[PDB]
Amino acid sequence: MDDEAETYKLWRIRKTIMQLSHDRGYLVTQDELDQTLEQFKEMFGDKPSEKRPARSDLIVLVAHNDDPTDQMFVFFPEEPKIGIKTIKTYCTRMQEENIHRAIVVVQGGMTPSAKQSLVDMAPKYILEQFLESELLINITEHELVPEHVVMTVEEKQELLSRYKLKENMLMRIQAGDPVARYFGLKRGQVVKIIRSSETAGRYISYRLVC
DNA sequence: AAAAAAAAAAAAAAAAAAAAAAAAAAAAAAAAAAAAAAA
């Protein structure tokens, strides 16, 4: 019962990770998005107890459409509580592969010293983290979550020039928001929210990531 | 007839329920530094 449930939750977490990577604009093929449970069992195995697949076997390397040298690692550590040793191992892998972006799918949580390592390591390499329970649901597919589109600096500048706005006068969204963590939004970006309206059909609002 | 002690009148004085945020204390795992055993 452990092997089948573990394979099912690993397949669901991998599907959510690949949908998250496709929503961020990274190069993801259609068969990876439409990968079934039986396809996952054929490709990676179905017995997670005897390392089929291993937790280090499910590492996901993905690249961006516009800039092919901007890539993401997705790590799947097997330890439930993550120390500084595995974080340092992943960081050394990031220097020796020259990649600035990675997401660590932790199981239980992280030590606060490792969180401080993520904080002060941040403006050279971005090292995000995600719980396993948070990645069992694609948040953007919920009926209460409208469409979120990340904007470039040109669209933000055009918005502030058109509406005569300053950046502090806009609405705000926290950096710890599940949608902002899903899209990987850093501080200063502006997210465009397109929602359905019952009086005008649809409505576009703008929020500043703080 | 002048001086002193006790009694009474006049004047100042002090004596209810709910809910959220912040502070605190025991605990508890983690991580860096110091001492000991062995090759």
List the resolution, Å.
Answer: 3.4
Contact flag, residue A113 CB and nucleic strand B, below 7 A: yes
Residues 146-175, chain A, CB closer than 7 Å to nucleic strand B: none
Q: What nucleotide is nearest A83 when CA is compared to C1'?
A: B30
Give the Cα separation of A83 and A91 in Å (integer).
Answer: 13
Residue A193's alpha-carbon distances to A5, A146, A163, in angstroms, are 36, 7, 16
Contact in structure between A72 and A99 (CB atoms under 8 Å): yes
- C1’ B32 / CA A176, Å: 31
- C1’ B8 / CA A139, Å: 95
DSSP 3-state percent helix, strand, coil across chain A (nearest 5): 40, 25, 35
Give the residue from A151, A140, A148 showing the smallest Cα distance to A190: A151
Contact in structure between A82 and A111 (CB atoms under 8 Å): yes
Residue where the block lists tokens 């501080």: A187
Residue A105's alpha-carbon distances to A16, A66, A73, A74, in angstroms, are 11, 26, 11, 7
Q: Would you state the structure tokens that stand for residue A184, as one six-digit string?
A: 């990987």
Q: For strand B, give the nucleotides within 7 A of a protein CB.
A: 29-32
Contact flag, residue A114 CB and nucleic strand B, below 7 A: yes
Q: Would you state the structure tokens that stand for residue A156, as one six-digit string?
A: 């933000």
Give the Cα separation of A13 and A20 in Å (integer).
Answer: 10
